[PDB]
Amino acid sequence: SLPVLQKESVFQSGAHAYRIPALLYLPGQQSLLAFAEQRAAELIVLRRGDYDAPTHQVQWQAQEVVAQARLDGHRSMNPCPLYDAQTGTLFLFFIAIPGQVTQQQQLQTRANVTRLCQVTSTDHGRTWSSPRDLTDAAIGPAYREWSTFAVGPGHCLQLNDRARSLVVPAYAYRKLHPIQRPIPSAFCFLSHDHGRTWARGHFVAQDTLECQVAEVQRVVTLNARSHLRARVQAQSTNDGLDFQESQLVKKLVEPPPQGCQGSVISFPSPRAQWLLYTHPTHSWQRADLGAYLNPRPPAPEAWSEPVLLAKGSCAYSDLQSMGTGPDGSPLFGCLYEANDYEEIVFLMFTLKQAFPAEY
């Protein structure tokens, strides 16, 4: 989007202390929660921001550490927030890894010591519950078959099915062969009971990493980072438990050989749903963050050419729809890494600003 409503650095560090953004919109409060990892143990920080209607700007409040989102002796990473519309409760899923090499790792280099955790809030994110280790309940037997894993980063998904199911995007490094290095593959964790029980979905294609999911029958579309020149996408008709054959989305470039995390969300069509996605647009560098639109999701061929949101160094990003903007079109919030990881920038713009040809 050429013109934007707001562009503000919400996290800054010449030492690259802030990375891995996660954004969550609270529709009732009309506020945003911006999460990020803070490095030197590694912790998750947060800044609350209220959408001020009179000025149509988000007023960001002081930064605070999410003290509860951590396990003793562990580093916290990959903030993955979710708003449960049925209860109003907020979930912050995250990963916890020992701060130093453990005795177990000393004997078995690839031993899994990564933990899946969560903290919840019933007061719009002002205070959080003590951490809950979901590892055993969500992963189970497969745990020892991986070297490590992660969720998100970025916002999770809640479906519009009867149960208002929760879907948490993830990926795991599978220890498929003793000599070969572990291979990552994306998948989803699924809960039909607001996080009481969890099911682990089947993996999508091999060599897929950080991913996010959106809903558009109702299908869950998973958009993942790859080591190829294009994004990998797959759709599921059973809430993410099983995905149809993965596809390469040539219209969405991925800078080889490492690729970069990107974000995707669905939003009500301005005419079903459309998809909005953000990711760097350079063919081989993490640069020039762009916004892409898919008016006939999840068809890979329907993705639009990107509109430049920010020129220069840009990496990870996270999107959130924020209701209706001042001009009458869908409002969006985007948190992204910029300037060689020296900052995390917040951008707010509308669909009309980003894709004027639509109006």
Report the interface residues with Cl ion, using CB under 5 A: 26, 28-29
Q: Compute the least distance from the CB of residue 85 to Cl ion, in Å.
A: 9
Q: Of 337, 341, 343, 358, which is the active-site residue?
A: 337
Tokens 């989007």 belong to which residue? 1
Query: What's the CA gap between 95 and 97, in Å, rounded?
Result: 7
Closest by Cα among 61, 59, 128, 52 to 90? 128
Buried b (16+ CB within 10 A) or exposed e, 161-186: eeeebbbbbbbbbbbeeeeeebbbbb
3-state secondary structure of 301: helix
Q: Compute the least distance from the CB of residue 68 to Cl ion, in Å.
A: 20
Contact 120, 180 (CB under 8 A): no
Q: Kindly state the helix (H) or strand (E) to which residue 307 belongs, with its residue range.
A: strand 307-324
Q: Compute the least distance from the CB of residue 52 to Cl ion, in Å.
A: 16
Residue facing Cl ion at closest CB distance:
28
Would you say 39 is a known binding-site residue?
A: yes
The verdict on whether 316 is a catalytic residue reads yes
Contact 16, 312 (CB under 8 A): no
Would you say 229 is a known binding-site residue?
A: no
Q: What is the largest CA-CA distance in the chain?
A: 62
Q: Compute the least distance from the CB of residue 12 to Cl ion, in Å.
A: 28
Query: What's the CA gap between 134 and 91, in Å, rounded?
Result: 12
Would you say 225 is a known binding-site residue?
A: yes
3-state secondary structure of 356: helix
Would you say 173 is a known binding-site residue?
A: yes
- Going by the DSSP 8-state scheme, the letter that residue 109 receives in this structure is T
Would you say 171 is a known binding-site residue?
A: yes
The verdict on whether 51 is a catalytic residue reads no
Toward Cl ion, which CB reaches closer, 1 or 121? 121
Residue 28 sits at the vertex; the CA angle it makes with 24 and 32, to the nearest 5 degrees, is 25
Q: What is the phi/psi pair of residue 142, to 5°?
A: -65, -20
Q: Compute the least distance from the CB of residue 24 to Cl ion, in Å.
A: 10
Query: What's the CA gap between 224 and 208, in Å, rounded?
Result: 6
The full length of the chain comes to 359
Would you say 19 is a known binding-site residue?
A: yes
Toward Cl ion, which CB reaches closer, 31 or 236? 31
Q: How many CB atoms lie within 10 A of CB 16?
A: 13
Q: Compute the least distance from the CB of residue 90 to Cl ion, in Å.
A: 8
Contact 179, 110 (CB under 8 A): no
Query: What's the CA gap between 52 and 305, in Å, rounded?
Result: 32
- Going by the DSSP 8-state scheme, the letter that residue 103 receives in this structure is H
Toward Cl ion, which CB reaches closer, 12 or 87? 87
Q: Compute the least distance from the CB of residue 321 to Cl ion, in Å.
A: 14
Query: What's the CA gap between 106 and 88, in Å, rounded?
Result: 44
Would you say 164 is a known binding-site residue?
A: no
- Going by the DSSP 8-state scheme, the letter that residue 143 receives in this structure is G
Residue ranges for the known binding site are: 19, 39, 171, 173, 210, 225, 286
Residue ranges for the known binding site for substrate are: 19, 39, 171, 173, 210, 225, 286
Active site residues: 316, 337
